[PDB]
Write an enzyme that holds these catalytic residues in place. Structure first.
Site, short mmCIF file in Angstrom:
data_model
loop_
_atom_site.label_atom_id
_atom_site.label_comp_id
_atom_site.label_asym_id
_atom_site.label_seq_id
_atom_site.Cartn_x
_atom_site.Cartn_y
_atom_site.Cartn_z
N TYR A 219 0.79 -1.22 0.00
CA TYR A 219 0.00 0.00 0.00
C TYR A 219 0.83 1.29 0.00
O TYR A 219 0.33 2.35 -0.36
CB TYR A 219 -0.98 -0.01 1.17
C1 F43 Z 1 -1.67 -9.63 -0.16
C2 F43 Z 1 -2.31 -9.18 1.16
C3 F43 Z 1 -1.19 -8.40 1.87
C4 F43 Z 1 -1.66 -6.96 1.80
O1 F43 Z 1 -1.00 -5.98 2.09
N1 F43 Z 1 -2.89 -6.88 1.37
C5 F43 Z 1 -3.46 -8.16 1.02
C6 F43 Z 1 -3.97 -7.95 -0.38
C7 F43 Z 1 -5.41 -8.12 -0.65
C8 F43 Z 1 -5.79 -7.53 -2.00
C9 F43 Z 1 -6.43 -8.79 -2.56
C10 F43 Z 1 -6.79 -8.82 -4.03
C11 F43 Z 1 -6.27 -10.13 -4.56
O2 F43 Z 1 -6.60 -11.18 -3.96
O3 F43 Z 1 -5.52 -10.09 -5.56
C12 F43 Z 1 -6.77 -6.38 -1.76
C13 F43 Z 1 -8.14 -6.56 -2.45
C14 F43 Z 1 -6.32 -4.93 -2.00
C15 F43 Z 1 -6.24 -4.60 -3.49
N2 F43 Z 1 -5.05 -4.76 -4.05
O4 F43 Z 1 -7.21 -4.23 -4.16
C16 F43 Z 1 -7.09 -6.72 -0.34
N3 F43 Z 1 -6.34 -7.51 0.31
NI1 F43 Z 1 -6.47 -8.06 2.28
N4 F43 Z 1 -8.52 -7.81 1.93
C17 F43 Z 1 -9.37 -8.24 2.86
C18 F43 Z 1 -9.19 -9.01 4.10
C19 F43 Z 1 -8.00 -9.58 4.42
C20 F43 Z 1 -7.85 -10.55 5.56
C21 F43 Z 1 -8.49 -11.87 5.12
C22 F43 Z 1 -8.34 -12.96 6.18
C23 F43 Z 1 -9.14 -14.20 5.83
O5 F43 Z 1 -9.28 -15.06 6.74
O6 F43 Z 1 -9.64 -14.32 4.69
C24 F43 Z 1 -6.32 -10.67 5.72
C25 F43 Z 1 -5.79 -9.90 6.94
C26 F43 Z 1 -6.17 -10.57 8.25
O7 F43 Z 1 -5.82 -11.76 8.43
O8 F43 Z 1 -6.82 -9.93 9.10
C27 F43 Z 1 -5.83 -10.08 4.43
C28 F43 Z 1 -4.56 -10.28 4.03
C29 F43 Z 1 -3.81 -9.56 2.93
N5 F43 Z 1 -4.38 -8.40 2.17
C30 F43 Z 1 -2.82 -10.32 2.04
C31 F43 Z 1 -3.33 -11.59 1.33
C32 F43 Z 1 -3.75 -12.64 2.38
C33 F43 Z 1 -3.75 -14.00 1.77
O9 F43 Z 1 -2.66 -14.50 1.44
O10 F43 Z 1 -4.86 -14.58 1.61
N6 F43 Z 1 -6.81 -9.40 3.79
C34 F43 Z 1 -10.36 -9.03 5.01
O11 F43 Z 1 -10.21 -9.22 6.21
C35 F43 Z 1 -11.80 -8.80 4.57
C36 F43 Z 1 -12.03 -8.25 3.16
C37 F43 Z 1 -10.76 -7.90 2.44
C38 F43 Z 1 -10.58 -7.11 1.20
C39 F43 Z 1 -11.52 -6.48 0.21
C40 F43 Z 1 -12.96 -6.33 0.60
O12 F43 Z 1 -13.14 -5.67 1.63
O13 F43 Z 1 -13.88 -6.83 -0.13
C41 F43 Z 1 -9.10 -7.09 1.01
C42 F43 Z 1 -8.48 -6.34 -0.07
C1 LIG Z 2 1.28 5.57 3.55
C2 LIG Z 2 1.20 6.54 2.39
O1 LIG Z 2 1.92 5.97 1.24
P1 LIG Z 2 3.44 6.42 0.91
O2 LIG Z 2 4.26 5.90 2.06
O3 LIG Z 2 3.47 7.92 0.82
O4 LIG Z 2 3.80 5.75 -0.41
C3 LIG Z 2 -0.25 6.82 1.94
N1 LIG Z 2 -0.99 5.59 1.68
C4 LIG Z 2 -1.94 5.15 2.52
O5 LIG Z 2 -2.09 5.62 3.65
C5 LIG Z 2 -2.86 4.08 1.97
C6 LIG Z 2 -4.19 4.04 2.67
C7 LIG Z 2 -5.20 3.08 2.05
C8 LIG Z 2 -4.71 1.66 1.82
C9 LIG Z 2 -4.52 0.86 3.10
C10 LIG Z 2 -5.75 0.87 4.00
S1 LIG Z 2 -5.68 -0.41 5.28
C11 LIG Z 2 -0.25 7.71 0.69
O6 LIG Z 2 -0.39 7.13 -0.41
O7 LIG Z 2 -0.10 8.94 0.85
#
Ligand code: F43
Ligand SMILES: C[C@@H](OP(=O)(O)O)[C@H](NC(=O)CCCCCCS)C(=O)O
Ligand SMILES: C[C@@H](OP(=O)(O)O)[C@H](NC(=O)/C=C/CCCCSSCCS(=O)(=O)O)C(=O)O
Lengths: 247, 568, 432, 432
Positions: free
Chosen positions: C364
């Site tokens: 992010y």
């Molecule tokens: C790659 C990451 C690392 C990171 O920085 N962000 C991710 C990335 C992922 C990507 C997934 C898209 C894809 O699958 O290609 C996005 C959608 C963000 C995006 N790029 O648009 C995202 N998460 Ni995350 N991500 C979520 C979530 C979660 C929960 C899921 C846990 C479970 O048991 O399934 C955990 C964190 C946790 O353990 O609390 C999580 C992890 C992580 N989050 C792991 C991937 C975990 C894995 O290997 O499966 N997400 C959620 O907790 C709920 C919904 C949710 C997302 C979008 C939505 O709100 O519909 C979302 C949204």
């Molecule tokens: C940290 C900071 O990013 P940089 O360190 O400046 O690259 C900042 N992003 C965010 O705070 C991302 C917020 C939304 C995605 C994660 C939500 S859990 C921004 O783009 O200004």
């Protein structure tokens, strides 16, 4: 010498959490070096550790009183890549919970990078240091091979209803009950292995209930743990009050 | 409340025990702890099927790879059953994918409606005319001014020869109304232009609003959605001011550009301007009227539930819903990141009645224990203390946790720790705010909920979830420069809050709850309350959660489409 | 009115019985000098300008103006350039202007006279006068025709003033432009961790110390150290940043061979009990002991000290910067579990560490530890008690990072690392 | 070398044979003191905080938090408040902190000690520490419950830190927040013309003088007065801003009864010719004489002086601020038509004046003259030679404006208009 008390609470959840934090864990199974390397998926089993930078002895180090006082891990000394082991744990009385896995790492291992999420918990460390940590987690009561899974990606399952056979859902089917034992035949990022890793029999629901670090109302209810609730309330009152005026 | 608990059960039944698409999820128990995974993949769901087909066809047509679920590592989406969501408080059963803001016109329009809106005082401009030109302003001159303005504001000429103009059929959502705390003036303005405070609000709320703003007169300006979408939020006040200026020139026979005109400009652009939000620092640089600048109080005031309901909990819950959608789905999930984004992070707080269940339970608990403190009133409120917060927040969280434990379906619904955290803390915070009439007591409650949650389950949210949590309790009642702030004035730019999902909408809800418990007419800005008390707006601000449902089932008509001037 | 002994990075006593109020950025001559010297100083890449001139590559990433090449030997004439630059930068002959040729003519240190700082609202005069002096010198020394003046100028200033900064330019100090401040009084907080570790030549304790000075000067300027908050912040500065009573160094030493975050907690709690800073308030039915602090600001300082000692041990062991984010989180989290007392900054160090962990391991934003600073959205939230640890962590990295100290900070290191009060900040503050 | 005589606003000799270099912001003790005092001073509306506490109206336009009323008699306790505030704002007993009760207890002047400026990157400490001290004092004095601490705090600080500034708060100085700067070294240029006229109590020459001090301080900080540009700026400052050789005042006197922009041009050209600053370079066939300047920076300074003298005459005659935009434009335009020489700042005063005229007579932005400043997008473009005229114009207005000095600058005026160096800037610069 100050002896750590670790965590409050007189219930089994308390005793388990203290076991996890102190590393006083029962060994329940064995995994060979090569099998562990296999499931971790970072290099061929039995192969040399790849490096990210030259060994400390080879490149030398800046003049630093801290570098001089703090012994590098074997992994740091050799310039290993930082690699990881990551686990998901069922909310249905998996022995481990994410925070307690991280506390276990931070307390018991040198040069570790634990991270806690709801659905996954990771330890990043120099490759060879990490493996020793993965070994402990894998061989002890900390991991149940049915209610938990080593998963580097696509971790979904902790909050999902169990399969009827008591195994936590894995979207990528890295491990499953075969012949009454849990077999893992893919690495933690779900690349198929040329081997079936035998992780032994899972815990009964009864055993997992007694071994879990999680509270649940149908097991050991958090509501009833006045001592841990008190802990929370104390920290809360302090943090609130001191943020107004630290006195 | 028994009616909410039952409604939660029904949501769990629809989601998990009735078949959806081809998911084969007929029958079963909402309390059972097991599931059969059929590994059907995406095709089990009707929307996914349609998306898959469109992706394949478009990839083929355009000649570069595109949407293809087989690109997902290991296996495609839907190894477990893909199940729907019910919009809380409604019977609208939506496809998950239809609640993505990109896929949902009601969500986009809600943002548009806010972005394109500002409020500009009229008093300063009238004084200018009187002082510099010696003009008399009367109801008649204002009426003529407002007719001129309603011609000019959409992008039409009033002064120069040989002007080109916006096409009216493209900008039919643009208009200007006025409201005033001067009852006599209100009665004399042509009704077509008036937001009638005495008609739109209860007698008590109208009196609070009028006492707040005194005898001042304000323009509620909504510029074209098409323009807002082409440009940005920082456009809004500039657009408003330009056409206000032209309208004054025309309506009052001023010189078309003289010194006095600059005074009108300064008043419209600065001295008498009220923006939805202010600008943001360099790292997240944006001008005014962006989501990040929108205080929690402001959002509370835009949402109109407070005006049409007398149920404190309902009012707060609508704000939570509007807030999680805007702040998490659009703002954090797009503006501040993007991609797949944060649909379900947000839906957790406006679907399946799970949040509502916990909150309404809390109301009952409070009323029982604090002599009806949660009922609408001012002198039934309890003074905020650590003891009160510890009592309410702890009880709230314990109950919400037990529900998740007793209903495995609910746990699987809110599969992410963050989702559960938002739900539990929202209820706790709203509950604390409802009892005390103190929004920051709501915040204390929010944080304590997180603290209890973490110890109960040995987990909380995503990796970064509790940055603001752990800073949370201590910063609630800090009076340090960049720490201290009433929740009403807090917003997405409050430093601890500037990054992470699952919080901002809750904080909006907490701000509202402090005021809705009291039956207050507004949370922080009566100007915004009245501005949005207007049924002409495309988005129904009184019912944001339902509106999202209408968008999910493709029944919401947005402004700003260009089909008129596009090939057919 | 607390007194502390100040010890250097090798556990040697520097100064006895120092009143903490004398350590205030508002009172301490050495800190004021560090601040003034930071404000008034900039680095200039002569090599960079020379390259931009010849190639037309100026004004930002990807940029190149074809057909406008100027071939000027800046590096070969660095001494004469430095002399002319000094003449332009100085206000009065014999003032405290200084201009030094660095790294064989590739770079300059420019220290504007303090008069410019006195006469200015902020610190940007060092950059603007520095750039102006270099631009004028080049035009004069190389005989740039007026029709080429824009090219010569932008080789120095980059895209300013189309951009708000000197984007793709060749003049920068340790600070950033005022407009990058998230908050009021934040300029001294907007210093990349990599910069700090570069300036202190990867000396971990010195990195933490230099960082603490800037951070606390920041907090002071933010009005975060007024009244009771003064003692609070200075206790932290002393115990965490300046190795008060040798505790940080001693804890490192005893945990250096086999210690973990866990054992460092034991060290801190043990001392707090011994020193009477905390006592058992109540024993719970399980035998768990709930502690209370006898002196809340002093407890906070112990937690701050512990947080840093834990960083030294954990990042030290791994020779890996990344360990810092979890160290800060788990040191404080486990400390609270151990005692029933609040962690450093009453949850705010742990808070920063949660977001910092995420933003140093996710898609992010953020990056490796080296990119963070006290003005960064992720790591601003604690009152100076987190970022020193980050600077320490970066210092300790043995080569795991993509964004190395050199890649972001090589120029700054070369130029500012030569200045002894920056390289040796504990000695500076202790008057040694 | 260049020397001038300095005359006051009534055409009395103050100092003779002054080296213009000694007038530099970087050299002149009195300028340095003005800047330092400007940096470290803020006004506090105790009446404002009081009403905000009582009504809940805090944090910006339209804002009101219902049901959180705090009834504290701040105005009636202003002396005790001022004393407590001093204790908190000060760094050491008997430093240069000052806290004064203004207009019967409705306001405070806070002058933060100069140590806070020295230890700061910028000037915001006066605001942040001033606000912190007031907040602390209110809490202390009235025993605010911690659950009401947020309300008391924001009564003072407004919407900060949701907003970048103390929006809807009650603490303000003469300057703006750093992040409002358009360019590098611009903070001192970001002072509303209305503020200057308030501070100088509507003394037109004093208004121009103080404005010139800030503007040139800005130009210096921008690196706009390096090398040959120093002489350039200081000649401008002397002749325009400081009534060098009584020229500005003398031209006003001779043009006072019947003069126009036109006659002021004749005054200026006649003097330029007499003093040998310009000479006929060529006579055209028509008999029109093309001039050239013998001393280009000097000619520029005459053009600067003339611009201001024209303002005095044109705005003075009309008693109307608005005349300043056309005056700046037409003085310079007609001067070029008269001579074949460039107008002030080689077109840049005229350029400012074109946009300023538009932006003080149109729908698009700006406002009356009083809103403009050296940092304003419209009026930043000249190197200090336009804004002093604007401050004069605002001073001269007899009541044509909507945005009166009082409406924007009453507090600032009440608080700053006291201090001698501010109300008598020419005397200050000259050493009386
Ligand atoms: C790659 C990451 C690392 C990171 O920085 N962000 C991710 C990335 C992922 C990507 C997934 C898209 C894809 O699958 O290609 C996005 C959608 C963000 C995006 N790029 O648009 C995202 N998460 Ni995350 N991500 C979520 C979530 C979660 C929960 C899921 C846990 C479970 O048991 O399934 C955990 C964190 C946790 O353990 O609390 C999580 C992890 C992580 N989050 C792991 C991937 C975990 C894995 O290997 O499966 N997400 C959620 O907790 C709920 C919904 C949710 C997302 C979008 C939505 O709100 O519909 C979302 C949204
Ligand atoms: C940290 C900071 O990013 P940089 O360190 O400046 O690259 C900042 N992003 C965010 O705070 C991302 C917020 C939304 C995605 C994660 C939500 S859990 C921004 O783009 O200004
Ligand atoms: C000047 C400043 O406005 P402010 O003084 O209100 O901040 C600034 N506004 C602008 O610069 C506006 C510029 C665009 C509109 C004017 C372009 S000139 S084209 C008009 C010619 S005419 O047909 O009207 O005669 C802003 O930031 O909004």
């Amino acid at each position: 010498a100050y002896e750590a008390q670790y965590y409050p609470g007189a219930t089994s959840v308390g005793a388990n959490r203290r076991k996890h934090m102190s590393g006083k864990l029962e060994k329940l199974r064995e995994i060979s070096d090569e099998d562990l390397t296999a499931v971790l998926g970072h290099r061929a089993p039995g192969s040399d550790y790849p490096s990210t930078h030259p060994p400390l002895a080879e490149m030398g180090e800046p003049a630093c009183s801290i570098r001089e006082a703090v012994a590098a891990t074997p992994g740091a000394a050799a310039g290993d890549r930082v690699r990881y082991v990551q686990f998901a744990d069922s909310m249905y009385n998996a022995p481990a919970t994410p925070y307690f896995r991280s506390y276990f790492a931070a307390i018991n291992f040198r040069g570790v990078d634990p991270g806690t999420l709801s659905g996954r918990q990771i330890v990043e460390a120099r490759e060879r240091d990490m493996e020793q940590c993965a070994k402990v987690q894998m061989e002890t009561e900390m991991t149940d091979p049915a209610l938990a899974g080593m998963r580097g990606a696509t971790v979904h399952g902790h909050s999902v209803r169990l399969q009827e056979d008591g195994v936590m859902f894995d979207m990528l089917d890295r491990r499953r009950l075969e012949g009454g034992v849990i077999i893992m035949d893919k690495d933690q990022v779900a690349i198929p292995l040329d081997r079936k890793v035998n992780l032994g029999k899972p815990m009964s629901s009864e055993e997992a209930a007694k071994r879990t670090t999680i509270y649940r109302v149908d097991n050991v209810a958090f509501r009833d743990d006045a001592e841990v609730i008190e802990w929370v309330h104390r920290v809360f009152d302090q943090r609130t009050s001191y943020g107004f005026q630290p006195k | 409340a028994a009616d909410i608990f039952a409604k939660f059960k029904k949501s769990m039944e629809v989601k998990f025990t009735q078949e959806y698409g081809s998911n084969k999820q007929a029958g079963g128990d909402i309390t059972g702890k097991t599931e059969k995974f059929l590994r059907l993949g995406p095709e089990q769901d009707a929307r996914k099927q349609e998306m898959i087909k469109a992706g394949k066809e478009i990839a083929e047509k355009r000649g570069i790879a595109f949407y293809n679920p087989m690109m997902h590592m290991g296996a495609p989406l839907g190894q477990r059953a893909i199940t729907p969501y019910t919009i809380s408080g409604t019977d609208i059963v939506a496809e998950p994918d239809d609640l993505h803001y990109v896929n949902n016109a009601a969500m986009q329009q809600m943002w548009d409606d806010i972005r394109r809106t500002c409020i500009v005082g009229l008093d300063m401009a009238h004084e200018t005319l009187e002082k510099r030109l010696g003009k008399e302003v009367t109801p008649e001159t204002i009426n003529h001014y407002l007719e001129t303005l309603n011609h000019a504001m959409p992008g039409a000429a009033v002064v120069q020869e040989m002007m080109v103009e916006t096409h009216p059929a493209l900008v039919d959502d643009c208009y200007v109304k006025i409201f005033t705390g001067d009852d006599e003036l209100a009665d004399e303005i042509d009704k077509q232009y008036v937001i009638n405070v005495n008609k739109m609000f209860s007698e008590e709320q109208a009196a609070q609003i009028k006492a707040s703003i005194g005898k001042t007169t304000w323009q509620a300006i909504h510029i074209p959605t098409i323009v807002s979408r082409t440009t940005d939020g920082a456009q809004t006040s500039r657009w408003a001011a330009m056409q206000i200026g032209m309208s004054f020139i025309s309506a009052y026979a001023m010189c078309a550009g003289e010194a006095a005109v600059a005074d009108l400009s300064f008043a419209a652009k600065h001295a008498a301007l009220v923006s939805m939000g202010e600008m943001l620092p360099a790292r997240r640089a944006r001008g005014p009227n962006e989501p990040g600048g929108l205080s929690f109080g402001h959002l509370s005031d835009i949402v109109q539930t407070s005006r049409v309901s007398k149920d404190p909990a309902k009012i707060a819950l609508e704000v939570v819903g509007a807030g999680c959608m805007l702040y998490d789905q659009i703002w954090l999930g797009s503006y501040m990141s993007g991609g797949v984004g944060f649909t379900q992070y947000a839906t957790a707080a406006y679907t399946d009645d799970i949040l509502d269940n916990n909150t309404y339970y809390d109301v009952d608990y409070i009323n029982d224990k604090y002599n009806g403190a949660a009922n609408l009133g001012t002198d039934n409120k309890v003074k905020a203390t650590l003891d009160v917060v510890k009592d309410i927040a702890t009880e709230s969280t314990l109950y919400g946790i037990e529900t998740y434990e007793k209903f495995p379906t609910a746990l699987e619904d809110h599969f992410g720790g963050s989702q559960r955290a938002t739900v539990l803390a929202a209820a706790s915070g709203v509950a604390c705010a409802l009892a005390t009439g103190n929004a920051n007591a709501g915040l204390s409650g929010w944080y304590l909920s997180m603290y209890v949650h973490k110890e109960a389950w040995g987990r909380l949210g995503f990796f970064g979830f509790d940055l603001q949590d752990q800073c949370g309790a201590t910063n609630v009642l800090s009076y340090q420069g960049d720490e201290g702030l009433p929740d009403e004035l807090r917003g997405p730019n409050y430093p601890n809050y500037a990054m992470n999902v699952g919080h901002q909408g809750g904080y909006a809800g907490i701000a509202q709850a402090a005021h809705s418990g009291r039956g207050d007419a507004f949370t922080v800005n009566p100007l915004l309350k009245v501005c949005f008390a207007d049924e002409l707006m495309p988005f129904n601000f009184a019912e944001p959660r339902r509106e999202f449902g209408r968008g999910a089932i493709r029944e919401f008509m947005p402004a700003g489409e260009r089909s008129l001037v596009i090939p057919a | 009115s607390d007194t502390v002994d100040i010890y250097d990075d090798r556990g040697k006593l520097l100064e006895s019985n120092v009143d903490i109020m004398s350590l205030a950025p508002t009172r301490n001559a050495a800190i004021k000098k560090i601040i003034l010297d930071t404000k008034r100083s900039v680095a200039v890449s002569l090599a960079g300008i020379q390259g931009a001139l010849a190639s037309g590559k100026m004004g930002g990433k990807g940029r190149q103006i074809l057909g406008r090449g100027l071939n000027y030997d800046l590096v070969g004439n660095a001494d004469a350039i430095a002399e002319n630059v000094k003449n332009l930068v100085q206000v009065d002959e014999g003032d405290d202007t200084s201009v030094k040729v660095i790294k064989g003519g590739k770079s300059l240190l420019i220290q504007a006279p303090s008069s410019r700082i006195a006469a200015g609202a902020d610190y940007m005069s060092a950059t603007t006068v520095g750039a102006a002096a270099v631009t004028q010198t080049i035009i004069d020394m190389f005989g740039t025709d007026m029709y080429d003046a824009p090219i010569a100028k932008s080789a120095v200033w980059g895209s300013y003033p189309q951009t708000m900064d000197l984007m793709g330019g060749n003049v920068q100090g340790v600070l950033s432009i005022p407009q990058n401040n998230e908050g009021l009084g934040f300029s001294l907080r907007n210093i990349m961790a990599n910069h700090i570790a570069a300036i202190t030549s990867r000396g971990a304790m010195n990195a933490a110390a230099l960082s603490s000075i800037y951070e606390q000067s920041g907090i002071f300027e933010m009005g975060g150290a007024v009244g009771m908050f003064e003692r609070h912040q200075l206790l932290g500065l002393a115990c965490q940043g300046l190795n008060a009573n040798n505790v940080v160094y001693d804890i490192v030493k005893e945990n250096g061979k086999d210690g973990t975050i866990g054992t460092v907690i034991e060290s801190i709690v043990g001392r707090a009990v011994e020193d009477g800073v905390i006592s058992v308030d109540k024993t719970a039915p399980s035998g768990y002991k709930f502690y209370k602090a006898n002196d809340v600001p002093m407890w906070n300082a112990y937690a701050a000290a512990g947080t840093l000692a834990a960083t030294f041990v954990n990042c030290g062991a791994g020779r890996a910067a990344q360990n810092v984010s979890s160290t800060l989180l788990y040191f404080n989290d486990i400390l609270e579990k151990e005692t029933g007392l609040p962690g450093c900054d009453y949850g705010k160090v742990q808070g920063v560490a949660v977001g910092f962990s995420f933003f140093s391991h996710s898609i992010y934003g953020g990056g490796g530890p080296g990119v963070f600073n006290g003005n960064h959205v992720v790591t601003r939230h604690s009152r100076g008690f987190a970022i020193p640890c980050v600077c320490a962590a970066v210092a300790l990295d043995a080569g795991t990072q993509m964004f190395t100290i050199e890649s972001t900070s090589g120029l700054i290191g070369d130029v500012f690392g030569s200045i002894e009060e920056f390289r040796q900040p504990i000695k500076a503050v202790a008057g040694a």
